[PDB]
Design an enzyme around this catalytic site. Structure first.
Site, PDB file in Angstrom:
ATOM      1  N   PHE C 140       0.865  -1.165   0.000  1.00  0.00           N
ATOM      2  CA  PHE C 140       0.000   0.000   0.000  1.00  0.00           C
ATOM      3  C   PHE C 140       0.902   1.214   0.000  1.00  0.00           C
ATOM      4  O   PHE C 140       1.681   1.400   0.932  1.00  0.00           O
ATOM      5  CB  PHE C 140      -0.910   0.050   1.224  1.00  0.00           C
ATOM      6  CG  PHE C 140      -1.862   1.219   1.203  1.00  0.00           C
ATOM      7  CD1 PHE C 140      -2.992   1.190   0.396  1.00  0.00           C
ATOM      8  CD2 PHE C 140      -1.604   2.360   1.949  1.00  0.00           C
ATOM      9  CE1 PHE C 140      -3.856   2.286   0.333  1.00  0.00           C
ATOM     10  CE2 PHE C 140      -2.460   3.456   1.891  1.00  0.00           C
ATOM     11  CZ  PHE C 140      -3.588   3.420   1.082  1.00  0.00           C
ATOM     12  N   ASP C 226      10.210   1.404   0.684  1.00  0.00           N
ATOM     13  CA  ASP C 226       9.186   2.357   1.063  1.00  0.00           C
ATOM     14  C   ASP C 226       9.234   2.435   2.588  1.00  0.00           C
ATOM     15  O   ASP C 226       8.711   1.562   3.286  1.00  0.00           O
ATOM     16  CB  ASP C 226       7.808   1.876   0.593  1.00  0.00           C
ATOM     17  CG  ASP C 226       6.687   2.853   0.943  1.00  0.00           C
ATOM     18  OD1 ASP C 226       6.922   3.822   1.694  1.00  0.00           O
ATOM     19  OD2 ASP C 226       5.553   2.640   0.468  1.00  0.00           O
ATOM     20  N   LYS C 255       5.301  11.182   5.791  1.00  0.00           N
ATOM     21  CA  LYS C 255       4.588  11.273   7.063  1.00  0.00           C
ATOM     22  C   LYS C 255       5.285  12.017   8.206  1.00  0.00           C
ATOM     23  O   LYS C 255       5.183  13.242   8.301  1.00  0.00           O
ATOM     24  CB  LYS C 255       4.149   9.880   7.512  1.00  0.00           C
ATOM     25  CG  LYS C 255       3.057   9.282   6.650  1.00  0.00           C
ATOM     26  CD  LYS C 255       3.047   7.755   6.800  1.00  0.00           C
ATOM     27  CE  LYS C 255       2.209   7.135   5.722  1.00  0.00           C
ATOM     28  NZ  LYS C 255       0.760   7.412   6.040  1.00  0.00           N
TER      29      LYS C 255
END
Ligand SMILES: Cc1ncc(COP(=O)(O)O)c(CNC2C=C(C(=O)O)CCC2)c1O
Ligand SMILES: Cc1ncc(COP(=O)(O)O)c(CN[C@H]2C=C(C(=O)O)CCC2)c1O
Ligand SMILES: Cc1ncc(COP(=O)(O)O)c(CNc2cccc(C(=O)O)c2)c1O
EC number: 2.6.1.13
Lengths: 402, 402, 402
Positions: C140, C226, C255
Site C-alpha cells: 500500500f 518504502d 509522514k
C-alpha cells in the site's frame, strides 16, 4: 466564353465544394497558363504538384496520342500488353519488388491501408480487426470517408457521419510520440508525408525520417510514405525521403506520375507485403489501363531525361533565399524543399493571403493560400532561373504594394 | 549564505530535475520577493499561481499560526472539528454538493480521473475497464505516471515507462474534435483547463467552454474543469469558466487555495458523481487535515474580502494593452485573462526568452519562460495599478534594451 | 460544535470516501488527543505514523512559525535559501548523494517509479516502455491510479478504470518468488516496505531484506524501500531496513518527516540513479518549499535529539510482551517492531475489531482496525513507560470486557 460567364455557369450547374481563385484558364504550356481573355500567367501551384513536367509536355502528350488509337481500356479481367512494361519500369526505377496500379491519390492511400491491415493479420499476427494505422496530425491524403477519418482538420471531417475505427493520430515531427504509439502491438503501420503539403508545407526536422524508419523497423510496423505530392523530383529528389536515405516499406505515388494528363496512382512495396492481397481481393476498373501506363512511363522519362530533380533543388534554394529577403512584418516565415515551398503571411487588419493571391494574379502569377495565412509557391520543375527570377520579382512587387 | 553558494549547495545535494532562474530568494511579502543579497524584486510568476493573495498574507499566516498550537493532523481515521467547517464553506462558495479534500494539484486530478471512471462504470454503465477520459493536447496537470500519460509534451513523458491506458487526446480549442471523440460511448469524461497555463497561456476562442458543456451533456460525459491554476480570481473571476457561465461536472482547485502556505487541493462535484466512491476506496494521509483547512478558509476569505477578482480583471486589461504597444519584431503576441498573461518573444540570433528573463531579473522583475519563446506575466492579485505600471516600465526597458 | 454535529456536517458537505471512528478531535499534544467534549485520549495511531514526534511538538511548531513570517513558497522556478540547507542535512543523515523533495507519500512513490523506469532505459538499457517494477502483494503506497495498479486489495483498485502496465506482483516475504521474478531482464526495480503497515503490520522473516538486497544487486535491479511509514524511528531505527544493515538503492520517506505539520515527502538515492532525470522532467509546485523544509529539518532533529528510536525499540518490546499475555481465544496474534505493532482479534459471533476499538475509545484510547480483525497499536514515539503501561491496562480491561 467570359471569365465571369464561366464562374457564373459553374456556380449554377456545379456543386459548391470549391471556392477557386477567380481566374478562368483555357490553355497551359510549360510553366504558363492563359485565361479566356488571353492573359498569360506563371503557374506557381502546378495543379498541386501534378504538373511537375509542365503543362501539356510534348513527350507525354505524344504517348497519350499514340496509345489512344490502339487501346485505352480492357479492364483487369484480361491482360493488356502495356501494363507489365510499365510495372517493370517503375519497380526498377524505385527499387521495389512490385507495384499496385490505381487511379487517384486517395486510392493509393486506401490500398496502402488495406495492405497494412492485411499484412498485420496474415503476417504480423494481429487478431482480426484490432489492427491500427497511425497518422500524423495535419495529414491530408484525400476525401474518402477513411481519409477524412485520419484528418485533424474540421473542414474535412465535420458533418461526415461516423468515422473509420483503427486510425490513431499523433503529432507530426515527433519521434517520442511515434515511439510511444508503437508500444501497442496492434499497430500495423504508420503513414506519413515526408513534408506535409496541405498542412502548409511543414518540413520535419532533419533526422525525423531516419527516426521513423528506425522506430517502425524496431517495432515491426510498416513505414508508409505518402510521396503523392513530395515525390517525383518536386522536392529535389526522386522521393523526398531520399534526403535521408530512408527506404519506406510502402511508397505512394500519384499526381505528377502522369504529368497531369491522366489520373495515375501507384503503391510500391516488396513481395512480403504486396502478396498479402490475393487475386480478387482488391482492384479498380481503370487501374493499370494501357493509356494511363503509356503516359506514366513518358512522365517518368521526362523527369529522368530532363534532370528535373537537380533543377528543382538548385532553383528552390534561390527561390527561398530571395523570399527570405522580404520584410518580417510582412512574411513571417519561408519554408520548403526543391520547388515545394510556402511563405507565411502576417495577416493584419487590411491584408491576408487571399488578397495577396488576388493581386499576385493581377501581376501575372497564379498561387493559392493553403491555410488562410500560408501561400504555396510550387512552379513546374521545368522552370528556368531567369523565369524564376522574373516571377520572384512579381512576388516582391505584389508583397511590397500593401 | 550567498546566491552562488545556494546554487552550489542545491546542485550537490539535490536532484537536477529543475533549472531555475539564477536568483536565490529568502523573503517575500505581497508582490515582492527579496534575495539573499537584499535585492528586491516584483514577483511576476506568483509561484505558478499559488500566491494569488500575495506572499505571506497576514490573514492566512494568522490562521496557520492559531491552528498549529491546537491540532495539525489526526488522519482521516478520526474526525477533526475543522474539516467540516471548511467543506460547508467551499461547497457553498462554489455551489456544489460536496468536496473531496486532497493535498497537491495532481492528486486532485487523479481523484477526478477516479471519480470519472468509477461513475462511468457504476452510473453510466461502461463495461469494466473500457472507460476512457479525453484530454486536450498541451494539457499539464502534474507529474504522476497517469498525468504524464495524457501529456503531448515529450519532456514530461519521454523515458517514463509504459503509459496509462484509457487516455485519449484531442486538439485543444476544437469543438468538432471533441464531438468526434464523444461518439465512443466508453468515454466517461473530458478534462480541460479553461486556459492552458503551461502550454503558454493559450486562451480558447469565446464559446469554446459553452460548446464543451453542451457536448458533454449531450453525450452523458463528465466535464472536468482543471481550475488549479486559472481559478480563484487569477483570471478575473472565481473560476475562469465563469466567463461563459459554464458549470463543469467536476471542478479542480489547488495552488492559491492556501495562499502558498500549505499544499491544499480540492475536487468539487455533486452527489451523483461524488458518492460513487465508497468509504475506504480513496483518500490521502494529509487530505483534509485541520491546519490545511484553516489556511484554506482564510485564503478564500482574502480573495472574497479584498475583491481580488475584479482587481485582476481591471489590471489585466491595462497590462495587456501596454504590452501590446511593444514592437512586433520583438513581441509577436500578447495573451491572457485577468492576471494570467504571457508574451511571445520572437527568438532570433542573439536574444531569447531566457535572456529577457535574466535581464528582467537584473531590472528587478522575476518571471520565467514557459516554452523557450513564451514568457508568463502573472503577479499577485494584490498588486496595485501604480505598482503594475512600474513593473510594466521595467518590462518595457528590458524588452527595448536588446 | 458537537461530535454528532461534526459527523453530521461532514456527511453532508464531504465525500464519503471514509468511515472514521466516531470521535471528533479538536486538540492534540504529545501522545494525547482531546475531542470537542473535552475528553482526553491516548493516541495509538499517530496519524498512521505521521506524528512520531507527538502532536504539535513545540520545536517543529516554532520552526513553522518562524518561517511563515519570512517566505512560504516561491516555486521551483527560482531558488529559496532554505531547500539546499535541508537537502544537505537529510542526504548526510541518511548517507545518500541526493534527495528529490515532494509533498505526499504517493508522490515519493511515483517519483521512485519514474526514477526506476528512467534508469532502466538510460542506464540499464531496457528497450523503451518494456520496463517493469515488481511489488509485493499486500503493498500500500497511496491512492493514485498507478499506486492502486500495484495493489492486490480490491477496495483500492476495483472500479478504477484500466490499470497501469508494467507492474508485476509477487508474494511478500518470498525470496524464491523474487528471484524467479528477477529473471526477466526488463525488470528495473522492486519496491518493498520493510514491514507492511496497511496489510496488517506484516513483518517479514529475518534475512528477507538481506535476501532482497542480494537478489536485486545480482540482477542489476533497483531496491526501492518504502520507509514512508516504517522509517524515522517508528520501528526502533532510523530506517526499519537498518535492522539488517541493508542499503536500498532508493529510500522513500514521508509522514513523520514533518511531525504532521506539513505534507513533506522525500526520495533518496545516489547520483547514478537520481541524475537520470534531467531539468524540467519531473517536479511539483510545493515540492521543496521553504516552509516545509524548515519543519522537516526540525522534525528530524527532534527524532535525533530525543533519541526516539531507542525509546521506540525499548517500549515496543514491553508493549508486545504485555499484549502476548492476553488470552489466545481473544488475541490470536501480536506482531510489530518498535512502536509499529498490531494484534489480531479472533472475530466471533458477537465481537470484532471495530467493536473493540469503539470500547477502547470509550476507555480513553484511540486506535483503528486495518483489516477487520487486525488492530494497530502505534502511539507517538515520545510516549513514556508509565504512560505506555497505563494505556496497556486500558487495552487489557477493554479486551477482557467482552
Ligand atoms: C499528400 C497527398 N496524398 C494524397 C492526396 C490525394 O490525391 P487525390 O485523391 O488524387 O486528389 C493528396 C491531395 N492533394 C490535394 C488535393 C486537393 C484537392 O482536393 O483539390 C487540394 C490540395 C491538395 C495529397 O496531398
Ligand atoms: C492546471 C494545473 N493543474 C494541476 C497542476 C499540478 O499541481 P501540483 O501537483 O500542485 O504541482 C498544475 C501544475 N502547475 C505547474 C507546476 C510546475 C512544477 O511542477 O514545478 C511548473 C509549472 C506549472 C497545473 O498547471
Ligand atoms: C507505506 C506507505 N507508503 C505511502 C503511503 C501514502 O502516503 P500518502 O501521504 O497518504 O499519500 C502510505 C499511506 N498510509 C495510510 C494508511 C492508512 C490510511 C491512509 C489514508 O487515509 O489514505 C494512508 C503508506 O502506508
Amino acid at each position: 466564353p467570359t471569365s465571369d460567364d464561366i464562374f457564373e455557369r459553374e456556380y449554377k450547374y456545379g456543386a459548391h465544394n470549391y471556392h477557386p481563385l477567380p481566374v478562368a484558364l483555357e490553355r497551359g504550356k510549360g510553366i504558363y497558363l492563359w485565361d479566356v481573355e488571353g492573359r498569360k500567367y506563371f503557374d506557381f501551384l502546378s495543379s498541386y504538384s501534378a504538373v511537375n513536367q509542365g503543362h501539356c509536355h510534348p513527350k507525354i502528350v505524344n504517348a497519350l496520342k499514340s496509345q489512344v488509337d490502339k487501346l485505352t481500356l480492357t479492364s483487369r479481367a484480361f491482360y493488356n500488353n502495356v501494363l507489365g512494361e510499365y510495372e517493370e519500369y517503375i519497380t526498377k526505377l524505385f527499387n521495389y519488388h512490385k507495384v499496385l496500379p490505381m487511379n487517384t491519390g486517395v486510392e493509393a492511400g486506401e490500398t496502402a491501408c488495406k495492405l497494412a491491415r492485411k499484412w498485420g493479420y496474415t503476417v504480423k499476427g494481429i487478431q482480426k480487426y484490432k489492427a491500427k494505422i497511425v497518422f500524423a496530425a495535419g495529414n491530408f491524403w484525400g476525401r474518402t470517408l477513411s481519409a477524412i477519418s485520419s484528418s485533424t482538420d474540421p473542414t474535412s471531417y465535420d458533418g461526415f457521419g461516423p468515422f473509420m475505427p483503427g486510425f490513431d493520430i499523433i503529432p507530426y515531427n515527433d519521434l517520442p510520440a511515434l515511439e510511444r504509439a508503437l508500444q501497442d502491438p496492434n499497430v500495423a503501420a504508420f503513414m506519413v508525408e515526408p513534408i506535409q503539403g496541405e498542412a502548409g508545407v511543414v518540413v520535419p526536422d532533419p533526422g525525423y525520417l531516419m527516426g521513423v524508419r528506425e522506430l517502425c523497423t524496431r517495432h515491426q510496423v510498416l513505414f508508409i510514405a505518402d510521396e503523392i505530392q513530395t515525390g517525383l523530383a518536386r522536392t529535389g529528389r526522386w522521393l523526398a525521403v531520399d534526403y535521408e536515405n530512408v527506404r519506406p516499406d510502402i511508397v505512394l505515388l500519384g499526381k505528377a506520375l502522369s504529368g497531369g494528363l491522366y489520373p495515375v496512382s501507384a503503391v510500391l512495396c516488396d513481395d512480403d507485403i504486396m502478396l498479402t492481397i490475393k487475386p480478387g481481393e482488391h482492384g479498380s476498373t481503370y487501374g493499370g489501363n494501357p493509356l494511363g501506363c503509356r503516359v506514366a512511363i513518358a512522365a517518368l522519362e521526362v523527369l529522368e531525361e530532363e534532370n528535373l530533380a537537380e533543377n528543382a533543388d538548385k532553383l528552390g534554394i534561390i527561390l527561398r533565399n530571395e523570399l527570405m529577403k522580404l520584410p518580417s512584418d510582412v512574411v513571417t516565415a519561408v519554408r520548403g524543399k526543391g520547388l515545394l515551398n510556402a511563405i507565411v503571411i502576417k495577416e493584419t487588419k487590411d491584408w491576408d493571403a487571399w488578397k495577396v493571391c488576388l493581386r499576385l494574379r493581377d501581376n501575372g502569377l497564379l498561387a493559392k493560400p493553403t491555410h488562410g495565412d500560408i501561400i504555396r509557391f510550387a512552379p513546374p520543375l521545368v522552370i528556368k532561373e531567369d523565369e524564376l527570377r522574373e516571377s520572384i520579382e512579381i512576388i516582391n512587387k505584389t508583397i511590397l504594394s500593401f
